[PDB]
């Protein structure tokens, strides 16, 4: 849901720039214990309402792993690196499931984000970071209904500044 990001430091907003037409994204997440989750998504704007259409194919999750055992705890926050490739945006991020017991199960998301606008109509951002905080606020019903929150910030690595004036 990448339309909802707070960009700081003047970083161009690829997602908001892509409307009214919208954008797509495509992703494969590789889990450290063998699982793969691939997804394609369409984002359009129907009047004032955003509409998402997502297709998913996941496979090779180990029957004894936290996913197929339904023994995942919660996602840690994460920081995606986002940069221009082939005139579109690539993102990569390492996420970590904090399982009940303390152990983390990590995964690596590989994403391409594609505007429905031509690249010449867009101001492309340089290399930057997107913090993502995703949280289940409520398991309404165990494998049936969930309330989810996300906060996201697009920024540079300002905590350790460059000695050369680089972002």
């Amino acid at each position: 849901s990448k339309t909802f990001i707070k960009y700081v430091s003047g970083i161009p907003d690829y997602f908001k720039q892509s409307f009214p037409e919208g954008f797509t994204w495509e992703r494969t997440t590789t889990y450290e214990d063998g699982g793969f989750l691939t997804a394609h998504q369409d984002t359009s704007l129907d009047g004032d309402c955003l509409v998402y259409k997502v297709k998913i194919l996941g496979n090779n999750f180990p029957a004894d792993g936290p996913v197929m055992q339904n023994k995942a705890g919660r996602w840690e926050p994460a920081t995606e690196i986002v940069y221009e490739v082939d005139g579109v945006l690539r993102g990569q991020v390492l996420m970590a499931l904090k399982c009940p017991g303390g152990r983390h199960l990590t995964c690596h998301l590989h994403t391409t984000y594609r505007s429905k606008k031509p690249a010449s109509a867009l101001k492309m951002p340089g290399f930057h970071f997107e913090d993502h905080r995703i949280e289940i606020m409520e398991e309404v019903e165990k494998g049936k209904c969930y309330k989810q929150y996300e906060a996201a910030v697009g920024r540079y690595c300002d905590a350790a500044p460059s000695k050369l004036g680089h972002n």
Binding site: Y52, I56, M137, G143, C145
Partner: protein, 64 residues
């Protein structure tokens, strides 16, 4: 834009999710609202086919 007074403070969204994970088919719908410039959002997702999910919902979080 001048100031925040002329930006849309909130924007609703709807979603449909269809897929298969380890041979299990499911479909979800979802509804939510967010603040596009503050970068926050909230949504409710419901599994309307293939529920209850035989795997952790968490693997779907980034797709919703």
């Amino acid at each position: 834009h001048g100031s925040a007074s002329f930006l849309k403070k909130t924007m609703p969204f709807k979603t449909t999710i269809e897929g298969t994970v380890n041979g299990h088919y499911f479909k979800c719908t979802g509804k939510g609202e967010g603040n596009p410039f503050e970068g926050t959002q909230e949504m409710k997702i419901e599994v309307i086919e293939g529920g209850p999910l035989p795997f952790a919902f968490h693997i779907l979080s980034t797709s919703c």
